[PDB]
Amino acid sequence: GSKKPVPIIYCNRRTGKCQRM
Amino acid sequence: GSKKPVPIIYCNRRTGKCQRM
């Protein structure tokens, strides 16, 4: 319940990946 | 100057702040 309610992510173009916080 | 083209940010609710990558 830390990233579910809050759509906080970070896509690192360097590695072409994205995840939630 | 890489986050300009790519709208990659990260708002840390913990500190209630958001910035670009």
Side-chain angles (χ1 to χ4, degrees):
Chain A
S2 278
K3 74 242 171 60
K4 268 138 193 268
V6 50
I8 34 191
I9 41 67
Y10 27 29
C11 330
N12 310 149
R13 294 303 307 174
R14 41 247 89 201
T15 154
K17 53 78 146 303
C18 203
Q19 325 102 145
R20 264 275 148 64
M21 309 205 213
Chain B
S2 217
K3 50 237 176 86
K4 267 138 77 201
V6 48
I8 37 193
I9 42 68
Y10 27 29
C11 330
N12 310 150
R13 297 302 305 287
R14 42 247 84 209
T15 153
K17 53 79 147 304
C18 202
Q19 326 102 145
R20 266 275 147 63
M21 313 221 273

mmCIF file with all atom_site columns, all heavy atoms in Angstrom, chain A:
data_model
loop_
_atom_site.group_PDB
_atom_site.id
_atom_site.type_symbol
_atom_site.label_atom_id
_atom_site.label_alt_id
_atom_site.label_comp_id
_atom_site.label_asym_id
_atom_site.label_entity_id
_atom_site.label_seq_id
_atom_site.pdbx_PDB_ins_code
_atom_site.Cartn_x
_atom_site.Cartn_y
_atom_site.Cartn_z
_atom_site.occupancy
_atom_site.B_iso_or_equiv
_atom_site.pdbx_formal_charge
_atom_site.auth_seq_id
_atom_site.auth_comp_id
_atom_site.auth_asym_id
_atom_site.auth_atom_id
_atom_site.pdbx_PDB_model_num
ATOM 1   N N   . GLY A 1 1  ? 0.806  -1.206 0.000   1.00 0.00 ? 1  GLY A N   1
ATOM 2   C CA  . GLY A 1 1  ? 0.000  0.000  0.000   1.00 0.00 ? 1  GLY A CA  1
ATOM 3   C C   . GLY A 1 1  ? 0.842  1.260  0.000   1.00 0.00 ? 1  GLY A C   1
ATOM 4   O O   . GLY A 1 1  ? 0.473  2.262  0.611   1.00 0.00 ? 1  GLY A O   1
ATOM 5   N N   . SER A 1 2  ? 1.980  1.210  -0.687  1.00 0.00 ? 2  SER A N   1
ATOM 6   C CA  . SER A 1 2  ? 2.880  2.355  -0.759  1.00 0.00 ? 2  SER A CA  1
ATOM 7   C C   . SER A 1 2  ? 2.937  2.912  -2.179  1.00 0.00 ? 2  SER A C   1
ATOM 8   O O   . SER A 1 2  ? 3.222  4.092  -2.384  1.00 0.00 ? 2  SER A O   1
ATOM 9   C CB  . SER A 1 2  ? 4.284  1.956  -0.300  1.00 0.00 ? 2  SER A CB  1
ATOM 10  O OG  . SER A 1 2  ? 4.385  1.985  1.113   1.00 0.00 ? 2  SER A OG  1
ATOM 11  N N   . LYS A 1 3  ? 2.663  2.054  -3.155  1.00 0.00 ? 3  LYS A N   1
ATOM 12  C CA  . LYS A 1 3  ? 2.681  2.459  -4.557  1.00 0.00 ? 3  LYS A CA  1
ATOM 13  C C   . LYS A 1 3  ? 1.343  2.162  -5.226  1.00 0.00 ? 3  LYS A C   1
ATOM 14  O O   . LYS A 1 3  ? 1.062  2.652  -6.320  1.00 0.00 ? 3  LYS A O   1
ATOM 15  C CB  . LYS A 1 3  ? 3.807  1.738  -5.302  1.00 0.00 ? 3  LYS A CB  1
ATOM 16  C CG  . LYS A 1 3  ? 3.517  0.272  -5.572  1.00 0.00 ? 3  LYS A CG  1
ATOM 17  C CD  . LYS A 1 3  ? 4.519  -0.632 -4.873  1.00 0.00 ? 3  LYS A CD  1
ATOM 18  C CE  . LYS A 1 3  ? 4.108  -2.094 -4.963  1.00 0.00 ? 3  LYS A CE  1
ATOM 19  N NZ  . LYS A 1 3  ? 4.012  -2.557 -6.375  1.00 0.00 ? 3  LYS A NZ  1
ATOM 20  N N   . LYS A 1 4  ? 0.521  1.357  -4.562  1.00 0.00 ? 4  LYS A N   1
ATOM 21  C CA  . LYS A 1 4  ? -0.791 0.997  -5.090  1.00 0.00 ? 4  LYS A CA  1
ATOM 22  C C   . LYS A 1 4  ? -1.698 2.219  -5.173  1.00 0.00 ? 4  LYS A C   1
ATOM 23  O O   . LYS A 1 4  ? -2.217 2.566  -6.235  1.00 0.00 ? 4  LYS A O   1
ATOM 24  C CB  . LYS A 1 4  ? -1.439 -0.076 -4.212  1.00 0.00 ? 4  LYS A CB  1
ATOM 25  C CG  . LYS A 1 4  ? -1.158 -1.494 -4.674  1.00 0.00 ? 4  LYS A CG  1
ATOM 26  C CD  . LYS A 1 4  ? -0.843 -2.410 -3.504  1.00 0.00 ? 4  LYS A CD  1
ATOM 27  C CE  . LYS A 1 4  ? -0.263 -3.736 -3.973  1.00 0.00 ? 4  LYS A CE  1
ATOM 28  N NZ  . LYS A 1 4  ? -1.321 -4.765 -4.173  1.00 0.00 ? 4  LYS A NZ  1
ATOM 29  N N   . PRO A 1 5  ? -1.896 2.890  -4.029  1.00 0.00 ? 5  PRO A N   1
ATOM 30  C CA  . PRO A 1 5  ? -2.741 4.085  -3.947  1.00 0.00 ? 5  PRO A CA  1
ATOM 31  C C   . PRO A 1 5  ? -2.118 5.284  -4.657  1.00 0.00 ? 5  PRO A C   1
ATOM 32  O O   . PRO A 1 5  ? -2.824 6.111  -5.235  1.00 0.00 ? 5  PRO A O   1
ATOM 33  C CB  . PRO A 1 5  ? -2.840 4.348  -2.443  1.00 0.00 ? 5  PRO A CB  1
ATOM 34  C CG  . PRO A 1 5  ? -1.611 3.731  -1.868  1.00 0.00 ? 5  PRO A CG  1
ATOM 35  C CD  . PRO A 1 5  ? -1.310 2.533  -2.726  1.00 0.00 ? 5  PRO A CD  1
ATOM 36  N N   . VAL A 1 6  ? -0.793 5.371  -4.609  1.00 0.00 ? 6  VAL A N   1
ATOM 37  C CA  . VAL A 1 6  ? -0.076 6.467  -5.248  1.00 0.00 ? 6  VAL A CA  1
ATOM 38  C C   . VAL A 1 6  ? 0.673  5.987  -6.486  1.00 0.00 ? 6  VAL A C   1
ATOM 39  O O   . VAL A 1 6  ? 1.620  5.204  -6.405  1.00 0.00 ? 6  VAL A O   1
ATOM 40  C CB  . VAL A 1 6  ? 0.926  7.124  -4.280  1.00 0.00 ? 6  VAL A CB  1
ATOM 41  C CG1 . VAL A 1 6  ? 1.798  6.070  -3.617  1.00 0.00 ? 6  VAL A CG1 1
ATOM 42  C CG2 . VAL A 1 6  ? 1.778  8.151  -5.010  1.00 0.00 ? 6  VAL A CG2 1
ATOM 43  N N   . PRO A 1 7  ? 0.241  6.465  -7.663  1.00 0.00 ? 7  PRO A N   1
ATOM 44  C CA  . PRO A 1 7  ? 0.858  6.099  -8.941  1.00 0.00 ? 7  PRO A CA  1
ATOM 45  C C   . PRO A 1 7  ? 2.254  6.689  -9.102  1.00 0.00 ? 7  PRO A C   1
ATOM 46  O O   . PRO A 1 7  ? 2.511  7.454  -10.033 1.00 0.00 ? 7  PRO A O   1
ATOM 47  C CB  . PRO A 1 7  ? -0.097 6.693  -9.979  1.00 0.00 ? 7  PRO A CB  1
ATOM 48  C CG  . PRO A 1 7  ? -0.768 7.822  -9.274  1.00 0.00 ? 7  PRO A CG  1
ATOM 49  C CD  . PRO A 1 7  ? -0.882 7.402  -7.835  1.00 0.00 ? 7  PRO A CD  1
ATOM 50  N N   . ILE A 1 8  ? 3.152  6.331  -8.191  1.00 0.00 ? 8  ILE A N   1
ATOM 51  C CA  . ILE A 1 8  ? 4.523  6.825  -8.234  1.00 0.00 ? 8  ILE A CA  1
ATOM 52  C C   . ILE A 1 8  ? 5.453  5.809  -8.888  1.00 0.00 ? 8  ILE A C   1
ATOM 53  O O   . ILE A 1 8  ? 5.694  4.731  -8.343  1.00 0.00 ? 8  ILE A O   1
ATOM 54  C CB  . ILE A 1 8  ? 5.048  7.151  -6.823  1.00 0.00 ? 8  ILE A CB  1
ATOM 55  C CG1 . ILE A 1 8  ? 4.462  6.177  -5.799  1.00 0.00 ? 8  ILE A CG1 1
ATOM 56  C CG2 . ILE A 1 8  ? 4.710  8.587  -6.452  1.00 0.00 ? 8  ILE A CG2 1
ATOM 57  C CD1 . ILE A 1 8  ? 4.718  6.582  -4.364  1.00 0.00 ? 8  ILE A CD1 1
ATOM 58  N N   . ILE A 1 9  ? 5.975  6.161  -10.059 1.00 0.00 ? 9  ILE A N   1
ATOM 59  C CA  . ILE A 1 9  ? 6.881  5.280  -10.786 1.00 0.00 ? 9  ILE A CA  1
ATOM 60  C C   . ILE A 1 9  ? 8.123  6.033  -11.251 1.00 0.00 ? 9  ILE A C   1
ATOM 61  O O   . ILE A 1 9  ? 8.254  7.236  -11.024 1.00 0.00 ? 9  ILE A O   1
ATOM 62  C CB  . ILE A 1 9  ? 6.191  4.647  -12.008 1.00 0.00 ? 9  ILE A CB  1
ATOM 63  C CG1 . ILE A 1 9  ? 5.325  5.683  -12.726 1.00 0.00 ? 9  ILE A CG1 1
ATOM 64  C CG2 . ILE A 1 9  ? 5.353  3.451  -11.583 1.00 0.00 ? 9  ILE A CG2 1
ATOM 65  C CD1 . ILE A 1 9  ? 6.121  6.797  -13.369 1.00 0.00 ? 9  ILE A CD1 1
ATOM 66  N N   . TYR A 1 10 ? 9.032  5.318  -11.904 1.00 0.00 ? 10 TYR A N   1
ATOM 67  C CA  . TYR A 1 10 ? 10.264 5.918  -12.402 1.00 0.00 ? 10 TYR A CA  1
ATOM 68  C C   . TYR A 1 10 ? 10.860 5.083  -13.530 1.00 0.00 ? 10 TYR A C   1
ATOM 69  O O   . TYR A 1 10 ? 11.506 4.063  -13.289 1.00 0.00 ? 10 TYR A O   1
ATOM 70  C CB  . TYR A 1 10 ? 11.280 6.061  -11.267 1.00 0.00 ? 10 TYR A CB  1
ATOM 71  C CG  . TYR A 1 10 ? 11.095 5.051  -10.157 1.00 0.00 ? 10 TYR A CG  1
ATOM 72  C CD1 . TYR A 1 10 ? 10.554 3.797  -10.415 1.00 0.00 ? 10 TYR A CD1 1
ATOM 73  C CD2 . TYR A 1 10 ? 11.460 5.350  -8.851  1.00 0.00 ? 10 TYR A CD2 1
ATOM 74  C CE1 . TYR A 1 10 ? 10.382 2.872  -9.404  1.00 0.00 ? 10 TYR A CE1 1
ATOM 75  C CE2 . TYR A 1 10 ? 11.294 4.430  -7.834  1.00 0.00 ? 10 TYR A CE2 1
ATOM 76  C CZ  . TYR A 1 10 ? 10.754 3.192  -8.116  1.00 0.00 ? 10 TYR A CZ  1
ATOM 77  O OH  . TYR A 1 10 ? 10.585 2.274  -7.106  1.00 0.00 ? 10 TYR A OH  1
ATOM 78  N N   . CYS A 1 11 ? 10.638 5.522  -14.764 1.00 0.00 ? 11 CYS A N   1
ATOM 79  C CA  . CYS A 1 11 ? 11.152 4.818  -15.933 1.00 0.00 ? 11 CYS A CA  1
ATOM 80  C C   . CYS A 1 11 ? 12.523 5.355  -16.332 1.00 0.00 ? 11 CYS A C   1
ATOM 81  O O   . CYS A 1 11 ? 12.645 6.484  -16.806 1.00 0.00 ? 11 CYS A O   1
ATOM 82  C CB  . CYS A 1 11 ? 10.178 4.953  -17.104 1.00 0.00 ? 11 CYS A CB  1
ATOM 83  S SG  . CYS A 1 11 ? 8.431  5.102  -16.607 1.00 0.00 ? 11 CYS A SG  1
ATOM 84  N N   . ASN A 1 12 ? 13.552 4.538  -16.136 1.00 0.00 ? 12 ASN A N   1
ATOM 85  C CA  . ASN A 1 12 ? 14.916 4.931  -16.476 1.00 0.00 ? 12 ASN A CA  1
ATOM 86  C C   . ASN A 1 12 ? 15.226 4.610  -17.934 1.00 0.00 ? 12 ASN A C   1
ATOM 87  O O   . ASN A 1 12 ? 15.580 3.481  -18.271 1.00 0.00 ? 12 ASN A O   1
ATOM 88  C CB  . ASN A 1 12 ? 15.916 4.220  -15.562 1.00 0.00 ? 12 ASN A CB  1
ATOM 89  C CG  . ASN A 1 12 ? 15.551 4.347  -14.095 1.00 0.00 ? 12 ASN A CG  1
ATOM 90  O OD1 . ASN A 1 12 ? 15.837 3.457  -13.294 1.00 0.00 ? 12 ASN A OD1 1
ATOM 91  N ND2 . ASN A 1 12 ? 14.916 5.457  -13.738 1.00 0.00 ? 12 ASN A ND2 1
ATOM 92  N N   . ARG A 1 13 ? 15.093 5.614  -18.796 1.00 0.00 ? 13 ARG A N   1
ATOM 93  C CA  . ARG A 1 13 ? 15.358 5.440  -20.219 1.00 0.00 ? 13 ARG A CA  1
ATOM 94  C C   . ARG A 1 13 ? 16.699 4.745  -20.440 1.00 0.00 ? 13 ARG A C   1
ATOM 95  O O   . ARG A 1 13 ? 16.857 3.964  -21.379 1.00 0.00 ? 13 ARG A O   1
ATOM 96  C CB  . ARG A 1 13 ? 15.351 6.794  -20.930 1.00 0.00 ? 13 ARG A CB  1
ATOM 97  C CG  . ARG A 1 13 ? 13.988 7.466  -20.945 1.00 0.00 ? 13 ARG A CG  1
ATOM 98  C CD  . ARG A 1 13 ? 12.935 6.577  -21.590 1.00 0.00 ? 13 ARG A CD  1
ATOM 99  N NE  . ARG A 1 13 ? 13.348 6.110  -22.911 1.00 0.00 ? 13 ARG A NE  1
ATOM 100 C CZ  . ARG A 1 13 ? 12.661 5.224  -23.625 1.00 0.00 ? 13 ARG A CZ  1
ATOM 101 N NH1 . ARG A 1 13 ? 11.535 4.713  -23.148 1.00 0.00 ? 13 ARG A NH1 1
ATOM 102 N NH2 . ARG A 1 13 ? 13.102 4.849  -24.819 1.00 0.00 ? 13 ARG A NH2 1
ATOM 103 N N   . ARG A 1 14 ? 17.661 5.034  -19.570 1.00 0.00 ? 14 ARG A N   1
ATOM 104 C CA  . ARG A 1 14 ? 18.988 4.438  -19.672 1.00 0.00 ? 14 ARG A CA  1
ATOM 105 C C   . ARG A 1 14 ? 18.892 2.925  -19.840 1.00 0.00 ? 14 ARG A C   1
ATOM 106 O O   . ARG A 1 14 ? 19.644 2.326  -20.611 1.00 0.00 ? 14 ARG A O   1
ATOM 107 C CB  . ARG A 1 14 ? 19.816 4.772  -18.430 1.00 0.00 ? 14 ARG A CB  1
ATOM 108 C CG  . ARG A 1 14 ? 19.029 4.687  -17.132 1.00 0.00 ? 14 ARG A CG  1
ATOM 109 C CD  . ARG A 1 14 ? 18.865 6.057  -16.490 1.00 0.00 ? 14 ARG A CD  1
ATOM 110 N NE  . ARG A 1 14 ? 17.660 6.737  -16.955 1.00 0.00 ? 14 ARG A NE  1
ATOM 111 C CZ  . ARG A 1 14 ? 17.484 8.052  -16.881 1.00 0.00 ? 14 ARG A CZ  1
ATOM 112 N NH1 . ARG A 1 14 ? 18.429 8.823  -16.362 1.00 0.00 ? 14 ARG A NH1 1
ATOM 113 N NH2 . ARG A 1 14 ? 16.359 8.598  -17.326 1.00 0.00 ? 14 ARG A NH2 1
ATOM 114 N N   . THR A 1 15 ? 17.963 2.310  -19.115 1.00 0.00 ? 15 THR A N   1
ATOM 115 C CA  . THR A 1 15 ? 17.771 0.867  -19.182 1.00 0.00 ? 15 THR A CA  1
ATOM 116 C C   . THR A 1 15 ? 16.398 0.522  -19.747 1.00 0.00 ? 15 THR A C   1
ATOM 117 O O   . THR A 1 15 ? 16.017 -0.647 -19.808 1.00 0.00 ? 15 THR A O   1
ATOM 118 C CB  . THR A 1 15 ? 17.921 0.214  -17.795 1.00 0.00 ? 15 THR A CB  1
ATOM 119 O OG1 . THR A 1 15 ? 17.167 -1.001 -17.741 1.00 0.00 ? 15 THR A OG1 1
ATOM 120 C CG2 . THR A 1 15 ? 17.453 1.159  -16.699 1.00 0.00 ? 15 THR A CG2 1
ATOM 121 N N   . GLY A 1 16 ? 15.658 1.546  -20.161 1.00 0.00 ? 16 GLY A N   1
ATOM 122 C CA  . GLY A 1 16 ? 14.335 1.329  -20.717 1.00 0.00 ? 16 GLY A CA  1
ATOM 123 C C   . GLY A 1 16 ? 13.462 0.475  -19.819 1.00 0.00 ? 16 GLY A C   1
ATOM 124 O O   . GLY A 1 16 ? 12.916 -0.540 -20.253 1.00 0.00 ? 16 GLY A O   1
ATOM 125 N N   . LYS A 1 17 ? 13.330 0.884  -18.562 1.00 0.00 ? 17 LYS A N   1
ATOM 126 C CA  . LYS A 1 17 ? 12.518 0.149  -17.598 1.00 0.00 ? 17 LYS A CA  1
ATOM 127 C C   . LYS A 1 17 ? 11.763 1.107  -16.681 1.00 0.00 ? 17 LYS A C   1
ATOM 128 O O   . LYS A 1 17 ? 12.191 2.241  -16.464 1.00 0.00 ? 17 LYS A O   1
ATOM 129 C CB  . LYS A 1 17 ? 13.398 -0.785 -16.766 1.00 0.00 ? 17 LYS A CB  1
ATOM 130 C CG  . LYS A 1 17 ? 14.574 -0.085 -16.106 1.00 0.00 ? 17 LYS A CG  1
ATOM 131 C CD  . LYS A 1 17 ? 14.143 0.684  -14.869 1.00 0.00 ? 17 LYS A CD  1
ATOM 132 C CE  . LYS A 1 17 ? 15.226 0.676  -13.802 1.00 0.00 ? 17 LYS A CE  1
ATOM 133 N NZ  . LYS A 1 17 ? 15.618 -0.709 -13.421 1.00 0.00 ? 17 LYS A NZ  1
ATOM 134 N N   . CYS A 1 18 ? 10.641 0.642  -16.144 1.00 0.00 ? 18 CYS A N   1
ATOM 135 C CA  . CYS A 1 18 ? 9.827  1.456  -15.248 1.00 0.00 ? 18 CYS A CA  1
ATOM 136 C C   . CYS A 1 18 ? 9.229  0.605  -14.132 1.00 0.00 ? 18 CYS A C   1
ATOM 137 O O   . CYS A 1 18 ? 8.777  -0.516 -14.367 1.00 0.00 ? 18 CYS A O   1
ATOM 138 C CB  . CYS A 1 18 ? 8.710  2.150  -16.029 1.00 0.00 ? 18 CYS A CB  1
ATOM 139 S SG  . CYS A 1 18 ? 8.054  3.644  -15.220 1.00 0.00 ? 18 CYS A SG  1
ATOM 140 N N   . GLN A 1 19 ? 9.231  1.144  -12.918 1.00 0.00 ? 19 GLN A N   1
ATOM 141 C CA  . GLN A 1 19 ? 8.690  0.435  -11.765 1.00 0.00 ? 19 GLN A CA  1
ATOM 142 C C   . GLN A 1 19 ? 7.963  1.393  -10.827 1.00 0.00 ? 19 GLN A C   1
ATOM 143 O O   . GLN A 1 19 ? 8.027  2.611  -10.997 1.00 0.00 ? 19 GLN A O   1
ATOM 144 C CB  . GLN A 1 19 ? 9.808  -0.286 -11.011 1.00 0.00 ? 19 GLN A CB  1
ATOM 145 C CG  . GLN A 1 19 ? 10.903 -0.826 -11.918 1.00 0.00 ? 19 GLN A CG  1
ATOM 146 C CD  . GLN A 1 19 ? 12.145 0.042  -11.913 1.00 0.00 ? 19 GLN A CD  1
ATOM 147 O OE1 . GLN A 1 19 ? 13.267 -0.458 -12.014 1.00 0.00 ? 19 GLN A OE1 1
ATOM 148 N NE2 . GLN A 1 19 ? 11.954 1.351  -11.796 1.00 0.00 ? 19 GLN A NE2 1
ATOM 149 N N   . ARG A 1 20 ? 7.273  0.835  -9.838  1.00 0.00 ? 20 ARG A N   1
ATOM 150 C CA  . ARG A 1 20 ? 6.533  1.640  -8.874  1.00 0.00 ? 20 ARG A CA  1
ATOM 151 C C   . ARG A 1 20 ? 7.369  1.897  -7.624  1.00 0.00 ? 20 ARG A C   1
ATOM 152 O O   . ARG A 1 20 ? 8.342  1.191  -7.360  1.00 0.00 ? 20 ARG A O   1
ATOM 153 C CB  . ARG A 1 20 ? 5.226  0.943  -8.491  1.00 0.00 ? 20 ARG A CB  1
ATOM 154 C CG  . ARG A 1 20 ? 4.023  1.427  -9.284  1.00 0.00 ? 20 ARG A CG  1
ATOM 155 C CD  . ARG A 1 20 ? 3.416  2.678  -8.669  1.00 0.00 ? 20 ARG A CD  1
ATOM 156 N NE  . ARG A 1 20 ? 2.837  3.559  -9.679  1.00 0.00 ? 20 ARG A NE  1
ATOM 157 C CZ  . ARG A 1 20 ? 1.809  3.220  -10.449 1.00 0.00 ? 20 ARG A CZ  1
ATOM 158 N NH1 . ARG A 1 20 ? 1.249  2.025  -10.324 1.00 0.00 ? 20 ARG A NH1 1
ATOM 159 N NH2 . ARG A 1 20 ? 1.338  4.077  -11.346 1.00 0.00 ? 20 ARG A NH2 1
ATOM 160 N N   . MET A 1 21 ? 6.985  2.913  -6.859  1.00 0.00 ? 21 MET A N   1
ATOM 161 C CA  . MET A 1 21 ? 7.699  3.263  -5.637  1.00 0.00 ? 21 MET A CA  1
ATOM 162 C C   . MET A 1 21 ? 7.063  2.592  -4.425  1.00 0.00 ? 21 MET A C   1
ATOM 163 O O   . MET A 1 21 ? 6.222  3.180  -3.746  1.00 0.00 ? 21 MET A O   1
ATOM 164 C CB  . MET A 1 21 ? 7.713  4.781  -5.444  1.00 0.00 ? 21 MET A CB  1
ATOM 165 C CG  . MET A 1 21 ? 8.182  5.545  -6.672  1.00 0.00 ? 21 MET A CG  1
ATOM 166 S SD  . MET A 1 21 ? 8.872  7.159  -6.264  1.00 0.00 ? 21 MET A SD  1
ATOM 167 C CE  . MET A 1 21 ? 8.397  8.107  -7.708  1.00 0.00 ? 21 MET A CE  1
#
